[PDB]
Amino acid sequence: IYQTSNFRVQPTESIVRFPNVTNLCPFHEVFNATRFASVYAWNRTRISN
Amino acid sequence: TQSYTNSFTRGVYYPDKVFRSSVLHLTQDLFLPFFSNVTWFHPVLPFNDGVYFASTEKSNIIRGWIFGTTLDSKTQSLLIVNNATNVFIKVCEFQFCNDPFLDVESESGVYSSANNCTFEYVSQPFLMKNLREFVFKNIDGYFKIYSKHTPIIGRDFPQGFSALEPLVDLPIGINITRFQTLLALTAGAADYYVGYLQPRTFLLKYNENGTITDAVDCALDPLSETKCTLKSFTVEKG
Amino acid sequence: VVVLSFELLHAPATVCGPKKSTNLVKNKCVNFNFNGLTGTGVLTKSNKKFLPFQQFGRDIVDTTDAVRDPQTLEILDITPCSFGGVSVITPGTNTSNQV
Numbered sequence: 001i002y003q004t005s006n007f008r009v010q011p012t013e014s015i016v017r018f019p020n021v022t023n024l025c026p027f028h029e030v031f032n033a034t035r036f037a038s039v040y041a042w043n044r045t046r047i048s049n
Numbered sequence: 050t051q052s053y054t055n056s057f058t059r060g061v062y063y064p065d066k067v068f069r070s071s072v073l074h075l076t077q078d079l080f081l082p083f084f085s086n087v088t089w090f091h092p093v094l095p096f097n098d099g100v101y102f103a104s105t106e107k108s109n110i111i112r113g114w115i116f117g118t119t120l121d122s123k124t125q126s127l128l129i130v131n132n133a134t135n136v137f138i139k140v141c142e143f144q145f146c147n148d149p150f151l152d153v154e155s156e157s158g159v160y161s162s163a164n165n166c167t168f169e170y171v172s173q174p175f176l177m178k179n180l181r182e183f184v185f186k187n188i189d190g191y192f193k194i195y196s197k198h199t200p201i202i203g204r205d206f207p208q209g210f211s212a213l214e215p216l217v218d219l220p221i222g223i224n225i226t227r228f229q230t231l232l233a234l235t236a237g238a239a240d241y242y243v244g245y246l247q248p249r250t251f252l253l254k255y256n257e258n259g260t261i262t263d264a265v266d267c268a269l270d271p272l273s274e275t276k277c278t279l280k281s282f283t284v285e286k287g
Numbered sequence: 288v289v290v291l292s293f294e295l296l297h298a299p300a301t302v303c304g305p306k307k308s309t310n311l312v313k314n315k316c317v318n319f320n321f322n323g324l325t326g327t328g329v330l331t332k333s334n335k336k337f338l339p340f341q342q343f344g345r346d347i348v349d350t351t352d353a354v355r356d357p358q359t360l361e362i363l364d365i366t367p368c369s370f371g372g373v374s375v376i377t378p379g380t381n382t383s384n385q386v
């Protein structure tokens with residue numbers, strides 16, 4: 001009797017389970033505002049986190 | 050004002066978020082040495098690695114905390130106020146008044162004025178004879194905070210064991226070399242204590258339910274070190 | 288016109304795009320990823336009593352054997368898929384060829 005090799009059951013598929021998505025950064029209001037004042041006086045806001 | 054007392058077996062918190070059942074995990078982290086020497090206050094206090102703040106403050110008198118470099122409107126600071134419905138954590142600057150007492154007419158009591166505020170996190174009040182224990186830790190700018198509420202009746206600083214849960218891990222990183230307390234309004238019943246954590250080694254005991262029920266310091270006395278070496282709570286003759 | 292500068296610099300980013308997910312399959316060998324916990328095995332239903340801040344679970348030898356799913360907060364066991372050795376039984380090739 002000879003011990004030759006090994007033996008395994010292969011995986012079927014793949015799964016990814018990142019948590020719920022929320023706290024979407026605000027970007028529509030910048031695009032959907034109907035006015036940007038002027039090019040010499042523009043509105044800016046910092047978006048982060 | 051300062052009267053001192055021993056620390057007994059207090060100030061143990063969950064080191065990580067891993068669930069273990071009926072094991073004995075030997076942990077290496079910053080902790081409060083057993084039978085230490087705390088200062089009972091009846092001020093200027095530095096911040097080297099973390100503190101154990103245990104204000105019983107029976108009704109409501111003590112509230113508020115200031116952390117940072119200069120504790121003024123010059124360098125970034127921190128605030129924590131939890132009254133009855135909301136708690137605020139402002140990371141902006143505030144010059145300091147003469148006393149850390151709240152005016153209760155809106156803000157001029159504890160601090161001077163406001164400026165250029167930034168990220169704010171809110172939550173439910175941290176409150177849920179009324180013992181309150183907190184541990185503050187700032188490592189690589191996550192500002193770990195731990196807490197445990199035991200309004201049960203004991204002594205002014207009794208014995209007993211209670212593990213401390215985590216509470217929040219705010220993404221911060223301001224410089225916190227010094228801090229100072231706050232209150233609302235010296236000869237008052239401002240019963241609270243301080244004490245610095247220390248890099249040590251412990252032996253925490255978990256139960257199948259998942260909660261720490263006992264622990265043993267590994268540098269107190271020879272028997273404790275023997276227990277840690279054997280990784281057990283019992284030792285046979287030898 | 289708007290200038291949406293995507294500055295990425297020494298300060299931590301903390302501003303990244305979203306991440307989608309897939310379904311949960313139980314009682315089947317599979318690969319998985321739970322917020323960055325790679326590994327393969329069979330996911331079943333467990334009767335453990337996590338405290339409401341504990342994510343993993345570990346044995347006496349530090350092998351992950353429990354996970355709390357992010358979307359739905361329940362407990363799943365983890366058992367690695369089957370493996371073992373293989374031996375071949377033969378008579379002499381001078382005799383026969385069956386095994």
Ligand SMILES: *[C@@H]1O[C@H](CO)[C@@H](O)[C@H](O)[C@H]1NC(C)=O
Nearest residue numbers: 053054055056084085086087
């Ligand atoms: C604490 O420090 C004081 C001196 O500050 C010392 O007399 C005392 O033995 C120390 N330990 C305890 C338990 O009070």
Ligand SMILES: *[C@@H]1O[C@H](CO)[C@@H](O)[C@H](O)[C@H]1NC(C)=O
Nearest residue numbers: 117118119120224225226227
């Ligand atoms: C933090 O502020 C203190 C003064 O409050 C200062 O001595 C120290 O150099 C600053 N930086 C660090 C890294 O502690």
Ligand SMILES: *[C@@H]1O[C@H](CO)[C@@H](O)[C@H](O)[C@H]1NC(C)=O
Nearest residue numbers: 130131132133134135136137
């Ligand atoms: C606690 O303080 C905040 C801000 O000072 C206030 O909005 C809130 O109403 C206070 N809580 C109660 C119960 O009044």
Ligand SMILES: *[C@@H]1O[C@H](CO)[C@@H](O)[C@H](O)[C@H]1NC(C)=O
Nearest residue numbers: 122123142162163164165166
């Ligand atoms: C607050 O921060 C802003 C921007 O960093 C700065 O212009 C201002 O001088 C600071 N102080 C006050 C009192 O606003």
Ligand SMILES: *[C@@H]1O[C@H](CO)[C@@H](O)[C@H](O)[C@H]1NC(C)=O
Nearest residue numbers: 255256257258259260262336
């Ligand atoms: C953990 O929870 C189970 C189920 O309620 C309970 O039977 C057990 O006593 C608990 N463990 C304790 C209280 O140490």
